[PDB]
Amino acid sequence: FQVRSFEEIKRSGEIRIGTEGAFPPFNYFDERNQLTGFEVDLGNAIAERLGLKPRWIAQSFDTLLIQLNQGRFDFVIASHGITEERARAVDFTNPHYCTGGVIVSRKGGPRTAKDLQGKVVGVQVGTTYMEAAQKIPGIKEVRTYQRDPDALQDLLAGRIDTWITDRFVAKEAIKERKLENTLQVGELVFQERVAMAVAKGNKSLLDALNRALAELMQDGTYARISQKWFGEDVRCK
Ligand SMILES: NCCSC[C@H](N)C(=O)O
């Protein structure tokens, strides 16, 4: 536990990276129990460009920014949307992708924010999806989940009417589980820029991560990794 500058991380030869591991296809443990996903490939490429061995630490999502500030990891890459409140708490890099939150229901279920009046909505705790659900008037209940996939299970089970989540995670879950005929993606409720985070005031590491990200976007690495995971370039445009 310590906030380490880039020079300090450099000499140790290793960088500790905090992530969640329950958010496919961004960061998740695969079927042979190895951490992977778009963010893991990116985090690895960044570490490699900076000459560092990555050490990944997977923790509950809602704990990540707090533990980062306590120095448990040097940076976090775990699909954090930039918000006013979070940007005070931690220092965000330039965004490593752009996305938005979407309504997903069973077929015939709610499609828009207006449709959610009198409805039960499922969201992951500590997320921008939760924050957004709290601002939509007339929702009967906002059920909170430790892990986003547990909200999807409850939607499939009929225990919630609607799951609010990331558009790429919704799209992939439907493909993966062959749910094209059971779920429908509704309105895009908000857009967000998603970024890596450093402990507040760690401007040394912040500069290094920004530099490596910009270098990956220029040299083709970012494109290759985005194409691998999404078949398209998901950078902020
Ligand atoms: N690894 C799980 C992260 S889900 C993050 C969501 N976009 C948010 O910004 O709250």
Q: Which of 62, 64, 123, 127 most suits a substitution to test ligand 1, by most atoms within 8 Å of the C-beta?
A: 127
Asked if residues 155 and 122 have their Cβ atoms less than 8 Å apart, the reply is: yes
Q: Cα(174)–Cα(172) distance, rounded to whole angstroms?
A: 5
Measuring from atom 3 of ligand 1, which residue has the nearest CA?
Answer: 79
Strand spans (E) along the chain:
14-19, 22-23, 27-29, 35-36, 53-58, 75-81, 90-92, 97-106, 120-124, 141-145, 162-166, 183-199
List residues bridging with 195 in a β-sheet.
80
Question: What three-state secondary structure class fits 28?
Answer: strand
Output DSSP code: residue 117.
B
Q: Cα(158)–Cα(139) distance, rounded to whole angstroms?
A: 16
Q: Cα(118)–Cα(205) distance, rounded to whole angstroms?
A: 46
Asked if residues 167 and 192 have their Cβ atoms less than 8 Å apart, the reply is: no
Task: Domains for the chain: give ranges and CATH numbers.
Answer: 1-97+196-237 (3.40.190.10), 98-195 (3.40.190.10)
Strand spans (E) along 177-218:
183-199
Instruction: Report CA(11)–ligand 1 centroid distance (Å).
Output: 32
Other C-beta atoms lying within 10 Å of the C-beta of residue 89: 15
- Report residues whose beta carbon is within 6 angstroms of any ligand 1 atom: 20, 23, 27, 61, 78-81, 127-128, 166
The data reach a resolution, in angstroms, of 1.9
Q: Cα(61)–Cα(136) distance, rounded to whole angstroms?
A: 23
Residues of the chain with a following break (C to N over 2.5 Å) = none
170: region left, alpha or beta (phi > 0 left; psi from -120 to 50 alpha) = alpha
Q: Cα(67)–Cα(74) distance, rounded to whole angstroms?
A: 10
- Please state how this structure was obtained: X-ray
Q: Cα(223)–Cα(215) distance, rounded to whole angstroms?
A: 12
Q: Which of 35, 61, 102, 191 most suits a substitution to test ligand 1, by most atoms within 8 Å of the C-beta?
A: 61
Which atom of ligand 1 approaches the CA of 21 most closely? 1
Asked if residues 97 and 234 have their Cβ atoms less than 8 Å apart, the reply is: yes
Phi, psi (rounded to 5 degrees) for 193: -95, 130
Instruction: Report CA(198)–ligand 1 centroid distance (Å).
Output: 16
Strands 14-19 vs 75-81: parallel, antiparallel or unpaired = parallel
